[PDB]
Design a protein around this ligand. Sequence first.
Ligand SMILES: [Zn+2]
Ligand SMILES: [Zn+2]
Ligand SMILES: [Zn+2]
Lengths: 270, 33, 47, 134, 65
Amino acid sequence: MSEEGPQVKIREASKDNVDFILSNVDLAMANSLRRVMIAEIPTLAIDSVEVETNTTVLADEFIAHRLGLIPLQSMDIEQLEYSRDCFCEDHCDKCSVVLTLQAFGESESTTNVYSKDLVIVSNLMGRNIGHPIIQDKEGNGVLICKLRKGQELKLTCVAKKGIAKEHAKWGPAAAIEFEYDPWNKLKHTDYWYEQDSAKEWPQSKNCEYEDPPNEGDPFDYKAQADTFYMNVESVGSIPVDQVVVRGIDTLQKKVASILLALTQMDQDKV
Amino acid sequence: KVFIGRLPIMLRSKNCYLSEATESDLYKLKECP
Amino acid sequence: TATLKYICAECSSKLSLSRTDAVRCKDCGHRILLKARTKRLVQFEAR
Amino acid sequence: NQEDSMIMNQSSIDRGLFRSLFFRSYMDQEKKYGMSITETFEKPQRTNTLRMKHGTYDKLDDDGLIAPGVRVSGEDVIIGKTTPISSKRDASTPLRSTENGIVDQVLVTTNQDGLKFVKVRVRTTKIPQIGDKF
Amino acid sequence: MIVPVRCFSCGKVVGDKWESYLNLLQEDELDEGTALSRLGLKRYCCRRMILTHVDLIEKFLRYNP
Ligand SMILES: [Zn+2]
Ligand SMILES: [Zn+2]
Ligand SMILES: [Zn+2]
């Protein structure tokens, strides 16, 4: 028996998912978090491509775009400042990770380019960062592009900090799930029905974990929202758990920066 | 036995090389199949 | 090394020249020819 | 989304939803004047005339063309050219004022009359913006 | 026109899963519907992504320089 208010109850686990039953909180909060997780958790991905040679069929920017979606590592990240804040005229190992990439069509039979082929050149400073997250079976992950005989492609990528607000590539999110009051004892909806509401509209896996209706009983007008069945997936860069704590955290910090301002704000004046 | 002007030929028609050609031939000719 | 310039549509092979040096390729009469990328490095945004 | 106009998930646009391409093809040849008075493809400038343009000519290699890697924008020249009269009047080809992007591939060929025929392609990636139509 | 790294809708990576799909078909001989279910593509946002892509790239790669 312990802990203040908000309390999880991990329903299941997976290197790529965290079906948990986060209960007893404000829906507002539940979501406010959900959101944070989606677009504001720091990540790391390519954001600058330097095409030296390209004979592909995918014109530069086409590739340059994918390269940015290619999930890159970021276990640490927190120890790699946003190029923008750093002082290095442009970028440096202090703010970014550099990768290489070259392919030639030796196999006169479709030579493939894979995220695995990227090559970290800048000092990794010793810290899990920049490694092309791979969840491939044969360990190739993310087919970048193809080429024929004498097709050549020479690049230079420069991954920086970033968050989903600036662009999706920095989305550690992938897709979260959300649901509550699986029976609708609050009536937050008005089921559209031709005949039987209960028939046409499928029930949910979450009905079980919550007491069914019970016709007799009147209506609860004091009904609120507790217990929310979420399912934070992930793309790699960050472990499905971090995509949740860092969510719980990132948000938290902001919620404090507000105080921080309430303070700095007072000190001032004559 | 004299020669007279030029008849701009319709593509993918009898008098067109493409009429015969296939896959390879085309792709080689750059002409999309 | 040996810097290139133009190229053949089919017999694609670095070429080059200048005014009056013909137009055809040093082989394929195919009088086409591209100008090939710049040594200069292009750059892009990963979005 | 009101009145036949939609809201479009930006997040998904990033991941590339509905991105398209766009190629344009500026072009030009070398005039003639019977008396063998012919034009030319070069990267001109002063040379008496002053009859030039306003876009950065620099992006012009010597053949009077732009390398297939360059990034064009305003009205930078894409084809330097001159006309012989009586001595260096311009006939260059600027960019689509509004448009702008990357040279995708230039090409030089003959032209029956032997004349130098040149077509130039400019690639551009257009992303779905708020005013766009679908 | 090459696989689409990640899903437009939600984002869940999908650039890798390509080769595995085409295989769980010509080889492992399955039916699209499951093939996909096999590679982790649960909800349709991701599903439609693969099931619909047209790998033109091949047809392109079959030209020249
Ligand atoms: Zn720096
Ligand atoms: Zn040739
Ligand atoms: Zn999806």
